[PDB]
Amino acid sequence: DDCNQTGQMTAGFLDWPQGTFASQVTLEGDKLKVERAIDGGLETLRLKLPAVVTADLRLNEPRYATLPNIMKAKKKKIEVIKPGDLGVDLTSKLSVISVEDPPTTEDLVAKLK
Amino acid sequence: LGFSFEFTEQQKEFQATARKFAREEIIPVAAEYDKTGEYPVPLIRRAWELGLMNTHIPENCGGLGLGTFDACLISEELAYGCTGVQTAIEGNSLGQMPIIIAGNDQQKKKYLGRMTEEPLMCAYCVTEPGAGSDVAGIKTKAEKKGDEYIINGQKMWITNGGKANWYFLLARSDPDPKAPANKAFTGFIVEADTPGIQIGRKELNMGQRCSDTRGIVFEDVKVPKENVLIGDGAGFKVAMGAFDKTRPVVAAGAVGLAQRALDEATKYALERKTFGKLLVEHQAISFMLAEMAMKVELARMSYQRAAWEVDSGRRNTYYASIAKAFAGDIANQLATDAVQILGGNGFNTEYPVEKLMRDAKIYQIYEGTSQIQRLIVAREHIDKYKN
Amino acid sequence: LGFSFEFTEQQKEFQATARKFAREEIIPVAAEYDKTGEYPVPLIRRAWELGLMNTHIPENCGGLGLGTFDACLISEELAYGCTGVQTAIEGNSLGQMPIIIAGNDQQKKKYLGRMTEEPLMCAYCVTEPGAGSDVAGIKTKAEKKGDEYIINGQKMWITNGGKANWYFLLARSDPDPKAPANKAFTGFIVEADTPGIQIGRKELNMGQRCSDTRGIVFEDVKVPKENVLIGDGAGFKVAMGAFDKTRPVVAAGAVGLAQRALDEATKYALERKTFGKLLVEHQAISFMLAEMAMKVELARMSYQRAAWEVDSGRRNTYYASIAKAFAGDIANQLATDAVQILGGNGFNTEYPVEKLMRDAKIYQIYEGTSQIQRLIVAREHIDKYK
Amino acid sequence: LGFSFEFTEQQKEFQATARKFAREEIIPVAAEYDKTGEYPVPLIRRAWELGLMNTHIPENCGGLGLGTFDACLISEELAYGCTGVQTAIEGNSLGQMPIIIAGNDQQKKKYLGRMTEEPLMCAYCVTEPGAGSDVAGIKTKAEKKGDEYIINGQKMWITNGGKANWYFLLARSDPDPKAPANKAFTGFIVEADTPGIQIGRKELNMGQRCSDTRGIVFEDVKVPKENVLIGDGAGFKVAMGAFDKTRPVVAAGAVGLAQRALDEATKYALERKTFGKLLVEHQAISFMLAEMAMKVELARMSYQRAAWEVDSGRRNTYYASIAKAFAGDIANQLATDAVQILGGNGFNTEYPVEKLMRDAKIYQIYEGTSQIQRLIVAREHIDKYKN
Amino acid sequence: GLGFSFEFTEQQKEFQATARKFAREEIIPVAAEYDKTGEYPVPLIRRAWELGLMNTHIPENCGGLGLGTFDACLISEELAYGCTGVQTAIEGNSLGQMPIIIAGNDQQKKKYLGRMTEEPLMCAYCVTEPGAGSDVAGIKTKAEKKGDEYIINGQKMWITNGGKANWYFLLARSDPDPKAPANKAFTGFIVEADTPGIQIGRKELNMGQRCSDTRGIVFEDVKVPKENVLIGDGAGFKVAMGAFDKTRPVVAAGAVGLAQRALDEATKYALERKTFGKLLVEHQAISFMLAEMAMKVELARMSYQRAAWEVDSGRRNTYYASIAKAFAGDIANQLATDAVQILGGNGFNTEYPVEKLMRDAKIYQIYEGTSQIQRLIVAREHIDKYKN
């Protein structure tokens, strides 16, 4: 869906601070130092620590599901539940109308802009 | 009970890892290693770190104790990146298999254990300069002398031949030529740093060039008696039992390559225009791609069938030799056509298909040639009908 | 889960019945029926009794309600005995399929129901003197004309054409030649003794001679609006939809005959001697035998796969066209090969293989020729790369 | 010298006669004779009249004294009409050849002359139920009893077997099983109405249905020693030597069948439309016709090669067996493909291709099987290299 | 005339022995070094020129021998048996020369054919482009007439002898209107390699025929004198087309030379290597393979002979040359892989002759018109006999 909303939105409902698009993370006790990727470069933040952080590309290189551990993970547990339980609705005043397909230098810097 | 062509979720996650490593780490350097013919160490160590090697080794030796089916789905993925590197790490199951199927409890925790601890290679040495297909014309002699044996002779075309910690070794036990093959040969576990052993220079072949292959000369090589596999004369059964569990994996290798050939030819056919149209709009090219797709899909199932039969406890000689003969064959057919569709570019050394043609030819020769596969299938077939 | 290549215990039961029927009852008379070419009415009825026919009809309508994978099982066993016989039987599933997948409960209870209660036949009418492979080329006209349509035109090569109770018919219901396949064809069920329906002479083909294949014309044939399949102009979608669940089975037919070819050839090589040796002991003949084995095993898996795909919920189009394409070709290779092994005898009518060769050519033609199959596969394949 | 692929002017007109005949007189009745199995006596007599039969018979017996190349080009034009009717005409030259090459002047003027005088048939007799391919395994007894031999046994599959004035018969004289083929069998000429000769019924084959093909039984049959060909135990050479001059014309038969199937598929593909285009505008149909026309053209040169070789004093064996193998294989390939191009019409009896496919199959079998043709080629070939 | 003959002229038996002696005494001994290194085999090319086995189509009045297409095929088969890389480098000359032979004037022929007579210069056929090979009519290299010259702008791809050539035959787009047909859109030039504007690219690295140089060439403002245009403006596509009648058979002879080498190798070896107690040739399957391989070669040989005989007779031979190049190329690949196969593991190994033959052969189904293209031509020729 290319959204970029859930992290932010979760952080709002808990009223916790959000550290969006993180390139780096540290605990400084009951505070998180969060580097984040903004348009010009990297801004740094500090957050009181119930917190919400959304991983950006830069943050890390994810690891491989190691064959041994794929097996070991078949043991570990997974509680399976409903949204109805947690006390959440679901009904949605959004609706998709459609999903189509994509289709001098004075003109050109104009047609990039 | 019931036919199923769907993987376990465990196998899916295996395939996904195998495939992440194949596309991400093998492919981007596979031409580089084919060009230099250098043994691909960093990748073998990575694959070992990921748990993708020595997959048959049982749990009580610190192994994963996984099926023939799992090896096959894994190794199709590695092959798709490169059959040179897939063959390298396949050499281990080959050398290991006899010990897994024929070794005692100390033999097993000794030679299998170490594979669990570091990434060491092993190889299977049977072929000699005078015999490959006719395994029963092996003439490397092995004499009992007290508490041990004296191995004398020369082995050819051995994968990991210069890279192995240890060898499965098959050698002629009995001088009597009236001796039945089935009881004429002994099979050993033979550490590679034994005195007498002379590994040769790297063999330069047309294909799978980064894989290590070489001749070995054994002179007066002392093998401790408690590394004999089952007994004297026992080797021939042992060596032959191995294939059940390894032939499917070689076939699965071939489809890997065929699949690669198919994707490379299908991408190009969607870019290149001739006479104002994409190549896919040329019925002859579609016909070609269809047939490649047919051959791959059946090749795939065939190795899937052989892997399932042995995993079910049954023996699979018929099905496995079907899979190798067909896979071998269609890997080659698919390599050339991929070259052909790419055209002039396909014949060039910076496009990725030319390597596949060169890599592919091996699959009609090692691990049993296209001819001796058909004798095996014919023999199993005929036997179903006689009293 | 995991992969499995084992039949279910109940499937083995089906297979067992089908094998025993084919070898005990079909084989003994298959050659007479090939010589004479008369429609094998006993064995049909008999197949009907043993439950090896109309396997697709849901229990809803007193059918046995089995999948495509079961229909393939049985069809291979029947075909091993005879593809003429086995074709006439599959003729009925061809006819049923469009109603099975696209009828309402009335249409199903009515036209599938009756098949349950007695061994009635039925046929699939699409091919025409001018179009076969190109289904959007059919010209047979249906004009809406009240609470009913009027059918005009000529179909051709209809299995069971002259032995059927009713027909799936497909006709050009939009006269504007610019209209698409999707909107231009309506598909009907059509009772055979409807006035206008003129059934032709029996056609005389190379093979599957006991099969009833014939032409049939329609002159102002009236068909009630109650018998339209999904609605006006859904004929194409419908006719097309049948193929997923029929082609796998046509391929099992091909595999059956392949198996038979190979069995005959192998028996003969084990007992015939030349240059002092059983034919088996010549490396050439061995290699032949082995290559044929290969082909069969592979052809069988291909169909088993397509069937499972469709029984599992999903479209099997790519898979079913691969199985058809390959089973059909290797059937023709096996049969001429099997003739080759028997030598002079092989070319002779008093031996069983010569028949196989004449039977097997059809499997590269009907239900979509080898070439059309390949277009489909290319299409399915290629679309996966954009 | 210099290569040439142009006919003599005579050869060109011989071709026209045979083509006039086949297209006017054979073609419009061929399917009728196929449907019925009636031995086509009007056409044989007609072919005899036009000098298109017994063409190998020397001049000094009143035959045309033509060469193998001539007989080949005639034989193609005939086969194109029908291989049922031309196999019956060729039968004659098969019966006549072992007398042409190995008979004495008496033998020739008597048994060849009558062929020259009226439309008689003769036949060739070697095959038995027990053997066809393995000629050195024939068991028909030929014992020296007087100024004669007594002939006991059974021949099977004999073209014109029920229609011949006389037979070339091959039977095993030396009863010591330890004797070579070289010395073991005798060739004979045998008047058909000799007593002791019981001719069985017309066998029914898939194809060449108008050709007459049957078994002959030989109960105590008395043959004059005069009807021996050169002497005792020389029968194998004579029957082997016949093939140089016959194997080429069989190949030319195959090609005629091939050329017919090509034309029919071409004529049709230029009239049938599908998906808006003519068949011929679908690249795959184009490629089939193109692979077909390649195949006919190469088989023709091959039989032409082998005719020329022998017509010029040379031994044929390699070039004749190549052309026999190849013409045979491709006729079968051409017939299915022609049935294929015509679709459902192809499969049906009202069209000319269904016949072609059933006719085409004996070409892999008789006058030497496909398999043994390769044993011959193999052999001739390996022999240029044995130093 | 007289009937058929498959007998060489005495004179042609003499050409045959010379090419063979060369191929066998001089090429064979060194082809695997030149294949291993990609080194352009200058001695052998000079030695083949010396011996008059090169530029043989050149007519006598330009200093050549004016040999036919049959003669040229004999000789190539012989060279190709030794090495296809070498023979391709020799052969390129004929391809470059051919449009000048068939379409050049007296000043053009004398000047540019004639110089080939007195030194072993090379020339090249400059057609294929990054974007078009099979579809000749898709080439876009520009030629605009500006003065009594033309100015060539374009890039060329896969040019055999491309960086070794005294001059080039070059095909270029003369007509800017893209709607302009192939019969009007193109003009063929003779271009001297040392013209300013011409930049020879790097040696391109292929699977096979590695000693042959094949190269990209870029033309940047290249000045071409009006007198080096072939028949005139817009004749380019016919002139390039016409070169093929005389050349297809010879590349077919090349494929046959390599085919025959493969056979001879695999036969020699199957008469010394034994398995299971017997020699390879006593195993039936191997024997059958050698047999089918021998068929394949004999038939290919006749096929190209027939093509060559047709054009020497003053007939256009499109149909027959296309069967040759289709059949010869398909079977050269077939024979190569079998030869490997029969040598088992050794065959896959680089110290044995055959793997190379397998790497060498694939190009025969690509260049001088793909396998598929040849079938389109054969189809078109075949079907026209039936349109009335």
Ligand SMILES: Cc1cc2nc3c(=O)[nH]c(=O)nc-3n(C[C@H](O)[C@H](O)[C@H](O)COP(=O)(O)OP(=O)(O)OC[C@H]3O[C@@H](n4cnc5c(N)ncnc54)[C@H](O)[C@@H]3O)c2cc1C
């Ligand atoms: C890259 C590579 C890696 C290898 N790795 C190993 C390895 O790690 N371990 C190992 O033990 N070996 C290995 N080998 C050797 C390989 O297994 C053998 O080459 C193969 O078994 C074929 O044997 P051969 O080369 O001796 O050929 P041969 O046995 O001489 O066979 C020659 C040819 O004749 C055919 N032939 C032989 N006998 C018959 C017959 N009975 N009937 C019909 N045809 C016959 C063969 O199919 C082949 O085409 C490797 C080989 C290669 C090329």
Ligand SMILES: Cc1cc2nc3c(=O)[nH]c(=O)nc-3n(C[C@H](O)[C@H](O)[C@H](O)COP(=O)(O)OP(=O)(O)OC[C@H]3O[C@@H](n4cnc5c(N)ncnc54)[C@H](O)[C@@H]3O)c2cc1C
């Ligand atoms: C014994 C028999 C029984 C039959 N029974 C039935 C039945 O009961 N019900 C029914 O509806 N039909 C039936 N048919 C019809 C059968 O399915 C058709 O013959 C088949 O679909 C092919 O169509 P066609 O004969 O019109 O050939 P065509 O469509 O004319 O095909 C001619 C040739 O051209 C090729 N071709 C056609 N279009 C293309 C193109 N797109 N691109 C490349 N190649 C192309 C074909 O592959 C073929 O080789 C039967 C046919 C037979 C022979």
Ligand SMILES: Cc1cc2nc3c(=O)[nH]c(=O)nc-3n(C[C@H](O)[C@H](O)[C@H](O)COP(=O)(O)OP(=O)(O)OC[C@H]3O[C@@H](n4cnc5c(N)ncnc54)[C@H](O)[C@@H]3O)c2cc1C
């Ligand atoms: C229409 C017809 C007309 C005939 N007319 C005549 C005639 O007029 N005169 C006459 O003498 N005969 C005639 N024959 C007989 C015919 O020539 C034989 O059928 C033929 O020689 C093949 O021999 P077979 O039938 O005994 O096959 P078999 O010898 O039993 O062989 C059967 C199969 O095994 C194969 N095979 C046998 N040996 C080997 C081997 N060592 N290695 C590999 N493969 C092997 C064969 O190729 C064949 O595929 C005719 C046959 C037919 C069908």
Ligand SMILES: Cc1cc2nc3c(=O)[nH]c(=O)nc-3n(C[C@H](O)[C@H](O)[C@H](O)COP(=O)(O)OP(=O)(O)OC[C@H]3O[C@@H](n4cnc5c(N)ncnc54)[C@H](O)[C@@H]3O)c2cc1C
């Ligand atoms: C080693 C080498 C040397 C060469 N030397 C020369 C030389 O010196 N001079 C020169 O001019 N060129 C030379 N070439 C170029 C060569 O001739 C071309 O590569 C060839 O003619 C066609 O190549 P392509 O790469 O453009 O094929 P593409 O046009 O990219 O075709 C790719 C594939 O599509 C298929 N295809 C394309 N169009 C159709 C269609 N309409 N219908 C069916 N199939 C189709 C082709 O068969 C082929 O398999 C050389 C090439 C090589 C590899």
